[PDB]
Every structure is written in C-alpha cells, then in structure tokens.
Design an enzyme around this catalytic site. Structure first.
Site, PDB file in Angstrom:
ATOM      1  N   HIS A  35       0.811  -1.208   0.000  1.00  0.00           N
ATOM      2  CA  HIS A  35       0.000   0.000   0.000  1.00  0.00           C
ATOM      3  C   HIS A  35       0.859   1.279   0.000  1.00  0.00           C
ATOM      4  O   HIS A  35       0.548   2.229  -0.715  1.00  0.00           O
ATOM      5  CB  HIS A  35      -0.874  -0.035   1.259  1.00  0.00           C
ATOM      6  N   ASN A 102      -4.052 -13.881  11.921  1.00  0.00           N
ATOM      7  CA  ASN A 102      -4.619 -14.422  13.145  1.00  0.00           C
ATOM      8  C   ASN A 102      -6.076 -14.840  12.948  1.00  0.00           C
ATOM      9  O   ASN A 102      -6.591 -14.771  11.827  1.00  0.00           O
ATOM     10  CB  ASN A 102      -4.414 -13.415  14.287  1.00  0.00           C
ATOM     11  N   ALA A 128       6.610  -9.230  15.950  1.00  0.00           N
ATOM     12  CA  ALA A 128       7.114  -8.302  14.934  1.00  0.00           C
ATOM     13  C   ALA A 128       6.375  -6.966  14.969  1.00  0.00           C
ATOM     14  O   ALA A 128       5.143  -6.916  15.074  1.00  0.00           O
ATOM     15  CB  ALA A 128       7.005  -8.924  13.557  1.00  0.00           C
ATOM     16  N   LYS A 179      -3.786 -20.488  19.353  1.00  0.00           N
ATOM     17  CA  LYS A 179      -3.314 -19.135  19.124  1.00  0.00           C
ATOM     18  C   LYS A 179      -4.384 -18.087  19.384  1.00  0.00           C
ATOM     19  O   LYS A 179      -4.097 -17.035  19.972  1.00  0.00           O
ATOM     20  CB  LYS A 179      -2.799 -18.966  17.696  1.00  0.00           C
ATOM     21  N   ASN A 183      -4.329 -14.508  21.467  1.00  0.00           N
ATOM     22  CA  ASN A 183      -4.649 -13.247  20.800  1.00  0.00           C
ATOM     23  C   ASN A 183      -5.904 -12.544  21.323  1.00  0.00           C
ATOM     24  O   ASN A 183      -5.916 -11.304  21.436  1.00  0.00           O
ATOM     25  CB  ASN A 183      -4.805 -13.433  19.289  1.00  0.00           C
TER      26      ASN A 183
END
Ligand SMILES: NC(=O)c1ccc[n+]([C@@H]2O[C@H](COP(=O)([O-])OP(=O)(O)OC[C@H]3O[C@@H](n4cnc5c(N)ncnc54)[C@H](OP(=O)(O)O)[C@@H]3O)[C@@H](O)[C@H]2O)c1
Ligand SMILES: NC(=O)c1ccc[n+]([C@@H]2O[C@H](COP(=O)([O-])OP(=O)(O)OC[C@H]3O[C@@H](n4cnc5c(N)ncnc54)[C@H](OP(=O)(O)O)[C@@H]3O)[C@@H](O)[C@H]2O)c1
Ligand SMILES: [Cl-]
Ligand SMILES: [Cl-]
EC number: 1.1.1.169
Lengths: 297, 297
Positions: A35, A102, A128, A179, A183
């Site tokens: 983008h 995710n 990250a 996961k 999250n």
C-alpha cells in the site's frame, strides 16, 4: 516455471517483512505488493544483523504480472477486501495462497478471492513490530503452523528450505484456536493501552483466567481439543513476556488504524451463539473494542 | 476580615479555572494555588469573551499566608494527598472548605486534612477542558449542587452572588450518586479512547443500560432515591452530548496522567460488597481501568 519458484508477498508489513527477509536470505526474490511505496523493506531480529529486502514495493496491481506459484498474504484481515485485486491479478489454479493472519477464519475469508487456488491457512507465532524509523523489529524466532496435505506441505517445504520453523499439524483446528486464546486475551492491552506487564497484576490475571475459560468453551464447541490446563497456561504465557511486549492490535489502535477486533474477539461471540453458549465477559469487551476501532467518537 | 472575603483556589485546572473566572468577574481576587507555574489562568466559555484571572499561580505553600475564609479545592482526587500541605497552611476552624470533585467520597477523603473546618462537598455539572494553548474551554454553563446547612448555604451565597447556578439539596446523597451514574458510564470512553458519540452505537448503548442498572443497585443500597427511569435517561444524556465531548478521565489517559478510576468506577465494587451485591460488568471494567491508570505495562 519448473525450477524458478515465482513468489509474491501481498502485505509487506511486520509479518510480511519477517517472511520476505527469510526468503531473501535464502536467495529468493519475492515480488513485494503493498500500500505505501518504499524502495525495499528491512527486518532487524534482536541480536542479529539487519536484512534488507529489495523492492520496490509495488502499489498498483497493474504494475505486476501473474500468475505466480506461491502467494503469501500478510495483510491484516481488515484489509482482505482491499487486497482482492492483487489475488485476482496474481493467482490461477496452480497458485498456492498462504494466509498469514490471526483468527480462525482464514480460508473462509480468502478462498472466494482465489476460487480455484489451494489456500493454506498459517498460524504465526512471532513478535514483529514496525518501528517509526521504517524497519521491522523481530523479537525471537518466528514459528508457523499449517495443516497437513499437499498444498500445506509444499508451502512448509519452501519455508523450511529457507530456514523457517514450521509445523504441519493434522489437527489444524486445535492449533488455530490455541493461538486465538492468546490473541483474544491480548485484546485487554488495547482497552488499557498497556503492554504485557499489565497481566502481572492480580486483578487483571484473575479476570484473564475467567475470559480464557469463556473463550475455551467456544473453542471446544468448534472442535478444539484443548486441556483445562490451557487457561492458566495462557495467562502465565502473557505474564512471562517481556514487560514492554505489545500486540499488533494495540499498535493499530495507537496509529488510529482499524482493528482486527472481529477476527480476534468478536469471533468468540459469533461462534458461541449456535452452541447456545454465554459469553458475558465478551459481551463487555467486544462493544468497547468495536467502538475503539470504528467509532463514532 | 468582616467585609473582605479571603478566598483560595487550590487546583487551578479545568474546574478550578471555571470557578476562579466567575469569582474574578464578580471582583474577587482568589489566591491561586497550583502545581505548574503560570502568571494567570484563562477561561473561554463557548460564545463568550475570554476571562483572564491574574495570578501568579503559587506552587509552594511557603509562598502564601493563611488562614482564609473560603478554600475551594478543585484538584483531582488522585492529587488530594499531594494537596494536603495547602490545606494545613490555609485552613483554620473558621475556614469553609468546598470540595469540587466527582464521586461520593469528598468529605471522607478531605475532612482529615482540615479536621476543624466545615467541609462542603460540591457536585459539579460542567464540560471544562484545558487546551494545548493553555486556556480552559467551557462548553455551556456550569451548575453546582451542594448540601443544605450553614456552611453549604454560605458557600452557595458566595457563588450565587458571583452569578453561578447552585442548588442546595436536602438529599445530597441522591444528588451525588446521580452524577456518579453519569461519570461511571463515561469510563467507557477511557477504554475505547472515543468521545461521547460512541454511545450512539446500538451495542454500546445496550451494554451501557446494563452497566447503569448495576451501578443503580449499589447507589440505592447506599441511600440514593432514584427512579428506574434513570437508567435509560443516563444513556440518552450521553448520546445527546456533542459528538466530540469527552470526559476528564479520558483527557488524563491521553496525557498519561493517573486516573480517578477508583473514585468513578472502583467505588461501585467497593460499596457493593457490604450489601452483598454482584457487579459483573464492573468486575471487567475496573481492572482494565486500574491497569490503564497505574500500569505496569
Ligand atoms: N505483528 C505480529 O507480531 C503478528 C504476529 C502473528 C500474527 N499476526 C497477524 O498477522 C497479520 C498481519 O499482521 P501485521 O502485524 O504484519 O500487520 P501490518 O504490519 O499492519 O502489515 C500489513 C501490511 O499490509 C499492507 N497493506 C494494507 N493494505 C494493503 C493492500 N490493499 N494491498 C497490499 N498491502 C496492503 C500494509 O501497509 P499500510 O500499513 O501502509 O496500509 C502493511 O504493510 C494479522 O492478521 C495479524 O493479526 C501479527
Ligand atoms: N473537567 C470537567 O469538566 C469536570 C466536570 C465536573 C467535575 N470534574 C471533577 O472535578 C475535579 C477536578 O477536575 P479537573 O478536570 O478540573 O482536573 P484538572 O484540570 O486536572 O485540574 C487539577 C488541577 O490541580 C493542579 N494540581 C495538581 N496537583 C496539585 C497540588 N499538589 N496542589 C495544587 N494544585 C495541584 C493541576 O495541575 P497539573 O495538571 O499541572 O498537575 C491542575 O491545575 C475532578 O474530581 C473531576 O472528576 C471535572
Ligand atoms: Cl519439509
Ligand atoms: Cl443564596
């Protein structure tokens, strides 16, 4: 195209740069599709030398030519609709499309944008974060989990060949929900505006265990095979993280960008409803997260 | 001291400047007692000319001489302990101490700092916000509610004489809890980081009605005489506010200052416990607010 593997990275952000850097260091030249224009992208893993991946980052689909062999999708799920023209341009029926997002809705969300391509959902475990200076900070090694089966095994081969840690799990549903428990809980950071050390408070940790248990009931109804021990394990995990470790959704909130609130937290409410499961803690968190993300106000 | 009234303002912030400006325009010279030095303070009511109140803002108690006749305390309740030396310096048994703070714990918190002075708790209804440029913005007229009785009536006389709107309420407990229902709900803005228009969402408004009802049960156990209609009235009130109206606790969160989370939200849990009342929504909000305010993270 029998020898050279054509790879495109759509979404050259924190996760995307992490993966592009491994591929580059292994000698591949991934096509960067993004983008915001930039000449290249840079990964700095703590303790390691920086890796600069040459671009340019292409920002119009008209500037690139497909089909490619592997398309790695690492946009936020908030950006899946806007990323669609990249997939139309670059995918055909022989393209393997890896979705590094995710949540637990990767295939459902992306498959219609590449209806004849094999989609490989990928659970990414890493920390990250894009820095103000323009480079991405990686704290620790990244690890990926994908399913079993031909497309997933081809993708795992490519990443393992480039030095990545990848697990091919015959129970991907369980891996994805594992996961998602982490999250979902990390959403607390978005509301408090604090990093992981907030979970070291007694009051937050007590609330956290109740929330993870509420999420766990939904995960199990959806097919996740997880032990009761996972509730306290999730809370110990976030407490054990470096005190200043955040989450990508907090970074988006601080940058006033749309949040993956529905992917990470709204999903708990949505999936609970067919099973007739109550989600009283989610009924508080979700409207506050959605308002934080989307306004008004 | 029979004619000239000696007035000190401790806490020359949004509310403090609002009150100091009225007093100044009426011809009084309040002694400004603060934390950050400034030559004077400025109030700009929307639609009106600015009022500049001359200082200096004194920042050490050693620089001033007491006793005074009226001390107006307008620090945040987070700052009551740090403000104590001003009260020791300036109050004697003839001083009337007005506490212009939110919550329902004004007398309990402040009386021990001026043990022989009459304390007048004051509920303030206004929208005042310090601007980056240094002046305070007031949107609409301020209104105050105080109790009945001699000290409260003397204080109301002083403010009414200077043009303020003041109510002397024989059921102050109810008036204080009425404001606290509004202020508690406004805590949602701190977690979402959005202004009042967030309450115009269906999901937030539904959650809001449930929270105000939970708070109402506690208010009633504590003696508040409020009708069931108040639940929906509170939610209509915040929806009807200008879309960009915030709350003082959100301003503190944006400035990374300690929050009045215990005064405005923690109090609901603390008071619920003697009555054996459940507060499931507060059990979610309070740890997130306390973490937001106090860390770690
Ligand atoms: N960060 C982590 O540590 C982490 C770890 C595991 C999983 N995840 C998950 O991984 C996924 C990606 O997260 P992230 O942290 O990498 O997000 P990110 O840093 O925000 O990266 C998204 C990238 O996509 C770009 N982009 C936006 N719209 C686009 C479009 N239409 N076409 C192509 N590119 C576009 C963005 O550019 P602009 O920003 O310039 O719009 C950005 O470079 C999310 O689902 C997240 O939850 C993140
Ligand atoms: N703002 C509103 O619209 C509003 C409306 C109704 C009720 N209230 C309530 O009114 C009370 C005051 O709120 P506010 O919005 O006026 O707060 P504020 O703008 O933060 O004002 C507090 C003032 O006290 C000063 N201060 C801090 N420590 C001090 C000390 N040790 N001695 C003397 N002064 C000190 C502050 O200076 P520094 O900032 O430089 O530390 C600031 O000038 C709160 O209980 C609040 O909930 C607010
Ligand atoms: Cl392999
Ligand atoms: Cl009067």
């Amino acid at each position: 195209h029998m020898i050279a593997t054509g790879i495109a990275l759509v979404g050259p952000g924190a996760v995307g740069t992490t993966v592009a850097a491994l591929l580059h260091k292994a000698g591949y030249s991934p096509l960067l599709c993004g983008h915001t224009p930039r000449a290249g992208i840079e990964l700095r893993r703590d303790g390691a030398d920086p890796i600069v991946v040459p671009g340019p980052v292409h920002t119009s689909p008209r500037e690139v030519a497909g089909p490619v062999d592997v398309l790695i999708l690492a946009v936020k799920a908030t950006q899946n609709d806007a990323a669609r023209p990249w997939l139309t341009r670059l995918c055909d029926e022989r393209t393997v499309v890896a979705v590094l997002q995710n949540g637990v809705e990767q295939v459902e969300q992306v498959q219609p944008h590449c209806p004849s391509s094999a989609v490989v959902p990928a659970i990414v475990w890493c920390s990250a974060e894009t820095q103000p200076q323009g480079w991405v900070r990686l704290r620790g090694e990244a690890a990926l989990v994908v399913p079993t089966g031909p497309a997933a095994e081809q993708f795992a081969g490519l990443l393992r060949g480039a030095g990545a840690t990848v697990d091919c799990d015959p129970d991907f549903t369980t891996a994805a929900w594992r996961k998602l428990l982490v999250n979902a809980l990390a959403g607390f950071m978005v509301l408090s505006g604090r990093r992981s050390a907030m979970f070291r408070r007694d009051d937050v940790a007590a609330l956290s265990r109740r929330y993870v248990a509420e999420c766990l009931a939904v995960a199990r109804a959806e097919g996740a095979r997880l032990d009761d021990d996972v509730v306290d394990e999730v809370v110990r995990l976030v407490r054990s993280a470096p005190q200043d470790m955040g989450t990508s959704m907090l970074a988006d909130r601080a940058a006033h960008r749309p949040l993956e609130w529905d992917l990470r937290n709204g999903v708990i409410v949505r999936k609970a409803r067919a099973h007739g499961l109550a989600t009283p803690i989610s009924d508080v968190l979700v409207p506050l997260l959605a308002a934080a993300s989307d306004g008004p106000g």
